[PDB]
Structure formats: structure tokens, C-alpha cells
Structure 1
């Protein structure tokens, strides 16, 4: 007499039905004994105890939100962070070190089928690896989820599994491969209120393989680096790890060399020295230097990199005042300009002139215009973000150079996506639009993949599949963001608005209301810069402040030129060289085109709590992520159809006891044997469907069968 009822504290909770009266049901909570009257439709059927901590939730007889949630909860507290959810995988961040990632465990998963061993990331990495050789098709592992859910941690475990199994211990390439993320994270990761090691970029790591299956090379593409983090940070947050590593670690000689001057003497360090618990910045600096040594970065490359990190900071120490009774920019103190110019290998007078009085061509004449304090601050800020992303791109292209040095492309690859998941913030700027546009494509991919896997399964069994593409639901929303013309999208109207002379951020929004106002996935807010978009996971209020500027990404042409002709060979290489929106759409088209031609493996990461705590599972927050992931839409769709499918030999062996009379003494066909057991059970012909190898059942039909 036990059931699942909705719970404000636990999401769902065990309770027993004491009295029924039509739709009204009076339950008694199996925790505190408190009486609760609620509707029959809020009540959720509970699974037999033989399903306690079930490794694959597709095995559940009663498929419901309450049963799935409890299955993940039971596993999580038993130390079990991995759970298979039929066609995809779920990972709940333990926030503690688990002993599941040793050399013994790697060897145990070598060539094992998904069902042959307990759930692990190693098994996803192995099944995709074996399939790549067997089927001769490219693979992908998609580690999705919120900030601090476990995307980076899992992505790296796939790398360390494959660097062991697909090795030619480890070997120069595999040793270097394991150093890519230590380097990239030093420059692209930061301490955030959500994650002490948040990825402030997204990546798709492509590992290349020999016909035999040996790692032959690798390439990494990065997306959306938060270059604005170099300038200023929110309360209790840090810039990229590298500034703290360098300042904390650098030798007495290095400090003097690169003109480094402590945590409190830099404006680009908004909160001074903020520490990362259980981590020392000086230790991490040595750990980063070591990784760059393994990757083959010469001491000169290492030192020129730290010299750029130092100049990025100095830029954010230059102070502009105003000439008396004018808006005109003045630099009364040359101290910072001199220090940064010594580092950038450029002339200080030529730099000062390039920031305060830049020469601009008008045709045919050239206007030397004096800048306002505001324009010069924007120019120095714009240049510091631009230098930093150009330093990340250089470090990245050098890592790729080290990792594809063999001039070998292989017969196949295994792509590993680790990009930022959907998150609604207080301010959702142009970057959030791009991140949320990306997830509209990654969720359409997942939805459509499940739709193909099922369409193919239903066809094999010869059972009727009356469903339209599950990916098509996310299509109008995408068309509101991309779509070049007929109704032009959000980005298309931005690109067009950036060309208008008098154009403003409000101007852009007014034009957006005028063009997309009555679009299904559009809503007017309630501020003249604000607008809403109804994404798969939820309504997001976007603020269009400085988007026109963000899409244009302007830099002072004069200083970029000086840097292009720097006396320092490295700085010169950085500045060796149309919209931000158009360029990102290209990156996403190219990534989606890649992913669409690989067999995808989904690894849905779940954050247990917003506290960064071990053994604390926030039920309603885990529920909120399964909704967002598509898990709850999945539970619904499979409830609608046939969730339980059993093979004839397994149906007979499992339920021989009940229909004892139906099976006559002798040899008989599997399909034939079951028909008679089904007929003896007097099962409704709407509840079942006989397939070519498995019997398809509606939800709770097999639960009824579960009796002794």
C-alpha cells in the first residue's frame, strides 16, 4: 500500500493511501506520519524493491519522474554517481574524490559491453571506441550541463581512458594529450560563485585514430572565451587562473623581468587576492610551467606568454583624466604607459598619440581627432580583452601544433564536446544569447537522435511509429535567432542595425519588436533595451545594452598597427592580422555539421546543490535539471508509448511460473510460446504489441505481472 506523492522538501516522498473518495486521496507520509489529502493524478506509482539502485533506468516497470528521481537519489548516496537512463547517461557531481578513476578500473572496462559492468564514463568512452572500429564511423561524447555540474571532469576522464586503451605508460603524444587541459584551463578558467574552476570557454576536442585504433593526433576548437573577465569581476570571483598563478609563483628574477607588482596594485584584479580552497596559486604556477614543458613550449615561449599576461594587467593601471573644462582625454602620469609599452615592445610616445589623438582616414583627407576620457578607457579596455583572447588563440594553436605534429589525420575521430550549458542569470547579454542559441541546437540534436534510434527500433520490430521529429519543436526558436531573411532573426537584425549611423541598442530592440513581435517564441518585457525569448528550458529576459558595440567589436586601428609592428617577435605574432554574431553562427554551423555526421553519446551532468557540498542532493534542483535536459519530456513520451520491451526467451524464463498451463511439454518457437502465456493471462490487445524479437508493453503492465 506504498506510493510516491509530491513533496515540497524532497521533490517526491513515500506515503501510504489510508482513504480514497473519488478523485480525492488521503495519504499518510512514510516519514513523519502527517496526513495529506491530494488528487489521484498527483499520485505516482512506486517500483518494486528489486529495482533498488537499478543501473539502467530503462529496466523500471513504472517509468515516472518520482521513480527516476528516487533511483538517482538512492545511487548518489551509495557512492554511485553514474546511472544509465536507457539511451543516455546521467552523472551527479559528488563534490568529493571517489576511488572509481584508478588504473585497475580503466583495465576492467577494456572491451566491456555497456551492460557487462556497472555504469561509468569509461564504458561510454569504450562503447564509442569499439563502435568506431566495428562500424567505421566517427564518434562523439557530449558532456552537457549547468556551471559546476561535471562537464570538464568527465571530459578529462574520457581523455585519460582513451590515452591508456588506444596507446601505441604512456608515450610522448598521450603524455602531451593529457597536458592540453592543464594549460588551457590555466588561461581560460576562473573562480566563480558557481565553480572554483569554471570553464570560461567551450571546447570540442577531436582525438584522431589509426585504422587499427591507435591515437594518432588531436585538435581542439574553443568557443566564446569570456575576454571581459580580464577587465572586471563580480563579488568573490577571480580573473583567469594564470594572473594569480604568475603573481603568486614567479621567481625574484621573473617578477623584475616582467614588471609584476602584487595583487592589490592592479585595477584589472577587482577583488585582490581571493584564494581557491585546497589549492595554492604558487604550486599551480609550477604545475602549469611543467605542463608547458611536456607540451614542448621552449622557455622563450613560456616567458613571452607570461610577459603578455603581465601587459594585460598593466593596461588596467593606465589612468585618463580630462583637460580642464573639456571632455578631452589627458594622461598626466606616464608610469603605466611606459611599463606596458616596454612589455608590448612598442614606443610610448607613439602609443600615447595612438590613444589620445588617433589618425582616421575620411577620404581623401585624414582626421586626427582628440578622444574623450570615456573613448580612451573603452579603447584600453577593448585592447586588453583583445590581447588576452589573442593570447588564448596563440596558446591554443601552439597546443594543436604540438598535438598534430605527426601530419597524420587518421581514418576516424572521437569528438568530445564540453560547452557551457543553459543558465538564466540576472543579466543575460549577447554572450548568453549565443550560449542559449547553441543549446537550442544541442537539444534539437539530442531530441532528434532519440527520435531516430526509436524510429529505427520500431521499424526493426515492425511496430507502428506515428510520431514526427522530436527535434522540430526547438525549430521556431532557432529561426527567431538565426534566419537571415523573409522574417529576419535576432542576429540578422543586429548585423543590419550595426550599419545604421544613428543606431542605438533601443533602436535595435524597436526594430526587433517591429519585425518579430508576434513570433511564437518572442515576448515583450516589463527596460527599453530588454526583450524575452522562450528557449526549450525557459523564458530568458535579454538586455541588449552595448550589443551593437559587442557585435562590431571595435579596437583602436592606430595601436593595433603599432603592435603589429612590435620590436618583440612574439607580440608581433599576436597582432599578425564580418560580425561577431555572423562568425559565431559559422562556428556553430561547422560544429553542428560535425556532430550530425558522428554517432552521439549523451552524458548529462547534474549539480547536486548550489552550495558546492558532498552528500547533499537538492531534490527540486536535480528535478529542474532533468526538465531542462529533456529527461522529463523523455519520461512523458515513453509513458505515452511502450516503455518496456522484453525478448521472448527472457519473457518465458522470467514469467513461466504464472502461465504454467499455457506452455505444453515440448519444443516450441519463442514468439509462439509467449502468445499463449499472453492469452492465458487475458491481456488487453491495446496493452501489448508482438514484435519480431521483443514484446512491446504499455507502462505498468509488467508491474501488474510482478507477483508471487
Structure 2
């Protein structure tokens, strides 16, 4: 029993190493400490200062430099006793301040212990290196063990959810959020891995389930500056089980795919993997059949400067990709056609428009055009026309407009994005067909989406994601509320979100999105019309809104995680997500069997006519609706720094994450009440010695508990006698720990 075998890798990689003695005395020390900032400017940089003395109302300690300072007792960030260093649950700390929470986390991360509970949450810090804790043998250990029975681990959370499901006959949810490169995806794959093993048919379906990711990642993931394998879409995976607890199916829901990246990538970034997998993996044969070339040869791949990922083989990845398509069950035809699309898009990107003639655009060279049309199976001349001379409705009239160069270009780009986005939807639906069960008994859904996003530039998509985030945070808070309430009750112990939410999605008065939809009808509205209307309704009128002192194209929202400034450029376009009808016509006719789908199926070809914002709001609401039906589990993934490096846990970086993600809030809140809630028996074991009275092992543990306390002459308001646990307010237990044997 590896859990008891101090020599196992379980013990090596998942636990704080244990010595021979457990004796209370070892940890004996006379010294007391505080967490201080050696620069009040840099607020997340603390040092530990021993406390030299105290006053009736303050503390006076010595800094690192031998420098002495004074602090208000009431402002002190007291350091937990060393015994607490490395606890598995932050909920176990007596002093629950910020430097303190960070310190426990860091102690743990320094031993490569990346998972730590914080009440209801599982906090996970990206190690940025391999830790062999995801083996089958590792899977095997977590089977049927209570949270409190094993070390923190994604597997653990997964096991709790699965037993809960079987036990309570209730659906469950695992919400894995955090920033780019934080490890959401990695953890998501481990949850599925785990389920697949604990509940799989001891597997074909299990295989197809697994192989679905890989497929999605090729088309929806890319190299960005924050992550070599960034998910440029959000997802909600539903793992379906039958009444007996065996995996019966699955369904996936995708959100917010970054279609833009298809036509543009920032420097050092790559387009989606697939492009490169195809280009490096196609047979010298398919190449020619696809008119393929290097990446350097394609405008959509030759701009970021980056065409390769360190320690990554696109060709090798292609195989893999192609392999999964196989498993899931994509026909060769389908497969070819999918490639053909990937290919055509590449060709479209290579279309050069020139002017001269007059002002309208022209295609002096038709090579690219020919190639794209060819692969798509559409008519080049029709394509040509639909791109540069779209017929447009002036009411009665349906007249062809001759587009200029840029406009022509923007249209081809729009075609490309629709192709990509639609193909992605189609892949998803294809997989679901295969995997999904109409009739299922239970499910455990996993959400793998970004947490709050606050970049340099925040656009429409950031607002969306941040809106989702407000909803999930408010979901957490409500949950936390019942759960925390349930508990006190069981032992016999005694919003702002809404306003932000309304600001965004309100119908009356109208919020940001309703105004944006309104502006959306008018062909002639502009980003200026839009932003002016926004300021007209909320500047000094809604407390969550801020009109900037000088910018004319931005506005701020006070979000849960703090203010975000958004820039309004292109929102109208984004909101409508326009594609010329002649382009729809052109492609509808596609000889291609798959192409035909992308344009002929309203479930793929269209939104409903709904705006992009309306659709987003609608999908978020179903989402939450579903979640409302489950028993949720929260995973907070934390990036340790901005460099993709191991052994480099940056306080500022980290602290920031903890503030925004609800971890520090939960605590502050928990802190307020009775944070420490110990099993009577557990208390006594550790403290019997402190009282000229009590024996380590007593059957009357509550009584034994009242002894030490009394021995100790501890304050009654500082602790609450719970049926099973002893509830200790903040610092109390630290003091107690701080007592003589």
C-alpha cells in the first residue's frame, strides 16, 4: 500500500516527506514572525521578520537587514507556525493572510507538490516540467479514496466526483479555469484519463473518446507567446455514464474559436497546428494533388516568422492526427476533404489583389484562385466575382459592386474564417455523432476555458470571456454559500456580480450587449456611434462603467477581477460576422461533399437572425443552466511566471492570480468565520500533552478537547464546539500550537 509505503513514488512525488518522529516537540521554537514588504511599493514582495516586541496594540519586528520596524498588530500578516508549512489544505492554516497563503503554496511547489486544496478549491501550479504522477499505477491509488485520505491531485477530485455521482445519483461538474499556459488542458485530459480507467469497459468507445481531443487540438490549438499548445477555443466535455457507472458516451461543446488567427498571427506565434501538420505530413503525392508547398510559400504561414515548435514534429503529429480521425471514424473521403479545405484556405490566402484599372480590384494572376477553387470544388469565375464583385441589395435593386483591393481582401479573409469556423463546428458535430448518447443516465462535465482575461488590448472576445467569468464566479459564490451554510448546520454551529453582469447583458435598461445589437442593424453605424451610445448610457450613470479621460475608443468595466479597459474597434463587424451572399452561393454549389455541408446545413451555416453577442449570451445561459443541475468541483490552475520556466514561482505573478481567481476572496471570507474545524480525536492526539490532564487516545475526545482548552484557559468566543469538529477562529490554533508541553 503505496499510501503507507514511504518509499513509493506516491510518497516521493505527492507527499511532504515524513521522518521518524511526529512528536510535537521537534517543532518547538520560541521565535514569532510576520510577513512584511521590504518595499511598500512592491506589495507582493514579502520578507519574514521576526517579532522583537509588542505593544498593547502593535508589533515591532526586525527586518532582514537587521532593520527594526513597527506594525499595527491589526495590520500584521502573522506567519503560521512551521508545522503548518506544507499542509495539504490552506483551510488548515490558522493565519490566513495573503503572504501566508502564498508561502504555503511556495513551500509545496519547492518540493514539486503542485496540487494544494484551498477549501473547496484544488489549486494546481504549472510545474513547467514532467512530474510522473499520472501513471496508471498512480491512477490506481486514488480509486475510492476520500479527499482527506490521499494527497491533493486532479485524480483525487475526479474520484470524488465519480463516487458522488454514483452515490448521490447526481450529475457533476469540474470547472478548470485560469490563464493561458496555466495547465487547464493538461488537467482536463487527466480527468478524462482517469474516468476512462475507473469506469471504462475493462475499449473502443473509450478509445474514440480519447482520440477526440487530439483531433480538436490540431484544428483549435496553436502556438502563441504564452503557450506552445494554446487552446484557441473553450470547451465543455460531457462524459456520459449508464446507471451502473460505466462510460456510455460523450459530447463536446466548443466556444469562441479564434478564427482570426487563421489569417493573421503575431510575431513568433503560429497559425493552428493542422496547417503545419499537413504541410510536413502530406505524402509527396497529396502535396501535388493539393498544390502544396512549404509554409514559407503561404501568406497565412509565412508572416510570424515562426513555422516550428521546439521539440515538436508536425509530421509525426500529423500521423497522430490522422490516426485519431481513423479511430473516431472519419472516412478517407472525409479526411481528404477536410485536408482539401485546409489546403484551399491556404490558397485563398495566397490570392493577390491589385488595382490600377481604376479603383476596383483585379486578379491579374489567377494561380491561387485556381487552386483554391480546385480544392473546394467551386467555380473559379464565380469565386472571382463573388470576391471582387459581389451583388448587393440597395433595396429593390440587387446590384453587383466592384470591390476595391482592401475591401476585396477583407472579404476573402471573411471567407476563410467562415470556412475554418464552420469546419471546426462540423468536426465537432461529427465527433459527437459518434460519441454521443441520447439516452444516458448520468454525466460528469468538464469545462476547460480561460479564466478572466486582462491584456494590453481587450476586444469583443475578452468581454465575452470575462462575462462568462463573472457568471462562473457568481456560481462559485452562491455555491460556497450553501455549502458553507450546510456544514455549520450539520455540526450544530451557529450582487456586485449582479451589477456587472447586468451592465453587460441587461435588457432594460439595456446593457452593453443590447446596445451593441441595436447599433448592429444600421448599415452605416460606426465604432464612434457605438462607443458614444455606450458612454451616453453609462458614463457617470452606472457605477461599474468608466469613460476614459482621453481615449475615444475605449471604455472600462469593473469586473470581479478588477477593471478592464476595452477597445471598440470593429465590434459591429464582429457582432454581425458578415459573409457576402454570393460567397455563400458560390460555396453552396461545391462539388465537395464536406464543403457542401458547411454551407448547406443551417445548423452549421447559420446562427439561428441572431447576433454574435446574442448567440454568446444564449450559449452561456444554457451552460450555466446545465451547471446548475450538477454538483460542481473547482480547479484553479496557476501559472508560476511568465516565462515558461520551472523552479521559478514569482509572487507577483502568482498573487495576482489568486486575487482574480477567487482563491484569496474565499479565504478572507472563510477567515472571517471559523476557518479551522478539527476532528476532536485529531486535536487530542496532537495536543493532549499541553494539558496536565488528557491522554493521547481517549474515547471521550470532545471532553478531552474541552480539557486542553480549559487547561489552556482559552477564550470561549475563539472556538466553537461542533458535533464532530472543534471550530477554531483565526490565529487561535496557531497560539495553541504555540503552547508549552
Give the TM-score band, short-chain normalised. Answer: over 0.9
Work out the CA distance in 1 between the residues paired with 2:588 and 2:67.
75
Establish whether residue 96 from structure 1 lines up as the match of residue 129 from structure 2: yes
Residue 620 of structure 2 is aligned with which of 588, 591, 594? Answer: 588
| Aligned-pair CA distance for 1:228 | 0.3
Task: Indicate conservation of the 8 Å contact 1:311/1:344, yes or no.
Answer: yes
Q: Write the deviation string for residues 610-638 of structure 1: whole angstroms up to 9, x where unpaired.
A: 11011111111111111111111122112
Task: Indicate conservation of the 8 Å contact 1:264/1:273, yes or no.
Answer: no
Match of 1:215 in 2: 247
For normalisation by structure 1, the TM-score amounts to 0.94
Residue 559 of structure 1 is aligned with which of 572, 580, 583? Answer: 583
| Aligned-pair CA distance for 1:42 | 4.8
Work out the CA distance in 1 between the residues paired with 2:305 and 2:150.
48
* Superposition RMSD in Å: 2.2
Match of 1:685 in 2: 716
Q: Write the deviation string for residues 665-684 of structure 1: whole angstroms up to 9, x where unpaired.
A: x9996555545654453333
Task: Indicate conservation of the 8 Å contact 2:692/2:711, yes or no.
Answer: no
Q: Write the deviation string for residues 64-109 of structure 1: whole angstroms up to 9, x where unpaired.
A: 2222211111111212111111221111101111111111111111
Match of 1:467 in 2: none
Residue pairs, 1:107-186, within 5 angstroms: 107-168=140-201, 171-186=203-218
Establish whether residue 700 from structure 1 lines up as the match of residue 731 from structure 2: yes
**SS of equivalent to 1:332:** coil
Residue 268 of structure 1 is aligned with which of 274, 279, 300? Answer: 300
Residue 288 of structure 1 is aligned with which of 297, 311, 321? Answer: 321
Work out the CA distance in 2 between the residues paired with 1:457 and 1:24.
35
Match of 1:72 in 2: 105
Q: Write the deviation string for residues 644-688 of structure 1: whole angstroms up to 9, x where unpaired.
A: 112334444443333445x79x99965555456544533333222
Q: Residues 620 and 459 from structure 1, CA distance in 2 versus in 1: closer, same or farther, beyond 3 angstroms?
A: same
Work out the CA distance in 2 between the residues paired with 1:97 and 1:202.
25
Establish whether residue 427 from structure 1 lines up as the match of residue 457 from structure 2: yes
Long gaps (5+) in structure 1: 465-471
Establish whether residue 574 from structure 1 lines up as the match of residue 607 from structure 2: no
**SS of equivalent to 1:115:** helix
Task: Indicate conservation of the 8 Å contact 1:249/1:286, yes or no.
Answer: yes
Match of 1:468 in 2: none
Work out the CA distance in 1 between the residues paired with 2:371 and 2:152.
55
Match of 1:643 in 2: 675
Q: Write the deviation string for residues 576-595 of structure 1: whole angstroms up to 9, x where unpaired.
A: 14100000101100011111
**SS of equivalent to 2:488:** helix
Q: Residues 599 and 533 from structure 1, CA distance in 2 versus in 1: closer, same or farther, beyond 3 angstroms?
A: same
| Aligned-pair CA distance for 1:604 | 0.6
Match of 2:291 in 1: 259
Task: Indicate conservation of the 8 Å contact 2:96/2:730, yes or no.
Answer: yes
Q: Write the deviation string for residues 343-402 of structure 1: whole angstroms up to 9, x where unpaired.
A: 111111121122222223445442222222222111111110110011111111111112
Q: Write the deviation string for residues 524-547 of structure 1: whole angstroms up to 9, x where unpaired.
A: 113322111011112111010010
Establish whether residue 15 from structure 1 lines up as the match of residue 38 from structure 2: no
Q: How many residues align?
A: 693
Task: Indicate conservation of the 8 Å contact 1:6/1:42, yes or no.
Answer: no
Task: Indicate conservation of the 8 Å contact 1:24/1:37, yes or no.
Answer: no
| Aligned-pair CA distance for 1:331 | 1.8
Work out the CA distance in 2 between the residues paired with 1:126 and 1:116.
12
Work out the CA distance in 2 between the residues paired with 1:537 and 1:289.
41
Long gaps (5+) in structure 2: 1-30, 602-609
**SS of equivalent to 2:447:** strand
269-278 or 145-154: bigger deviation: 269-278
For normalisation by structure 2, the TM-score amounts to 0.90
Q: Residues 534 and 558 from structure 1, CA distance in 2 versus in 1: closer, same or farther, beyond 3 angstroms?
A: same
Match of 2:236 in 1: 204
Q: Write the deviation string for residues 400-456 of structure 1: whole angstroms up to 9, x where unpaired.
A: 11212xx45321000000012212112111111101111111111112211111111
Task: Indicate conservation of the 8 Å contact 1:5/1:42, yes or no.
Answer: no
Work out the CA distance in 1 between the residues paired with 2:500 and 2:152.
35
Match of 2:640 in 1: 608
Residue 355 of structure 1 is aligned with which of 370, 387, 412? Answer: 387
Match of 2:398 in 1: 366
Q: Residues 179 and 494 from structure 1, CA distance in 2 versus in 1: closer, same or farther, beyond 3 angstroms?
A: same
Work out the CA distance in 2 between the residues paired with 1:461 and 1:202.
40
Residue 510 of structure 1 is aligned with which of 512, 516, 532? Answer: 532
Work out the CA distance in 2 between the residues paired with 1:216 and 1:419.
24
